[PDB]
Structure formats: C-alpha cells, structure tokens
Design a protein around this ligand. Structure first.
Ligand SMILES: [Mg+2]
Ligand SMILES: [Mg+2]
Ligand SMILES: [Mg+2]
Length: 52
RNA sequence: GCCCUGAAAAUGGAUGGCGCUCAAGCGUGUUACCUAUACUCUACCGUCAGGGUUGAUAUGAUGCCCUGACGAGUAGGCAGG
C-alpha cells in the first residue's frame, strides 16, 4: 500500500517506483546466451605469446 | 712575412699558473689519443598510444597481459596521493 506494486498504486500522490535500465544484473548469463554465442568469433589465449 | 722602433699611470700581478726558444711560439699538412646529462644497444620507473582476454571451480574487467614511442622547465593549469 505504501510503495505500490504492478497492480496497486502507491499511496503517495503521483509516485511510482523507479524503473530498471537493465533487465538483469548478471551479464555473464547474457553473454552465455545462444544468440550472442552464435554471432561472435572465437577468442584468443588470454595471455599473448611473446614473438620477438 | 716574422721581429724591432713608434709604445707614458698610478697597491704587487697574471698567454689561467708554472714555465717554454730546431718551442711547450707563428703558418700549414698527416695520424694516434682523451672525454658530455648528446648518439647506439640493453635493463628498470613512469607517461601516452594501439591491441589481447568474462569461461566456470581461486580472490582485484577501475583486473591481468601483449606491442611501440616518449621523459628540460619559471609564471600558470590539471591529475594521482
Ligand atoms: Mg704547428
Ligand atoms: Mg650520454
Ligand atoms: Mg617534465
């Protein structure tokens, strides 16, 4: 009642809860999604060999 | 050309000094040699630039790592402590 919900308006006059700018906070799961993984090229070594 | 005369100033006095006369002087030529915080190569510190790497089960993605170049400073500006 005090802060409102998706189906209940907050008792505060004209107030609504802040909106998220990102759907989820786990970016690793987003990267591991099939859509992203099927569009990227294979990675490297994480520590480049010294050639000279 | 060199040397000499012309050429007289006040404390004692300065090719830097000693000293030097086929010079250790003057003109010229040929080599060797000495040494700057400059140049070449290497290491380390920092700065800037271009790149690699989120995959869980081990910790900093402002993380870790690869490559190249650069570094004087009053007045003054900015940044990290
Ligand atoms: Mg001579
Ligand atoms: Mg030097
Ligand atoms: Mg400086």
């Amino acid at each position: 009642q005090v802060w409102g919900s998706e189906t209940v308006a907050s008792s505060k006059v004209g107030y609504t809860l802040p909106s998220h700018i990102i759907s989820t906070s786990d970016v690793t799961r987003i990267i591991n999604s099939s859509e992203i993984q099927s569009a990227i090229r294979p990675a490297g070594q994480a520590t480049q060999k010294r050639t000279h």
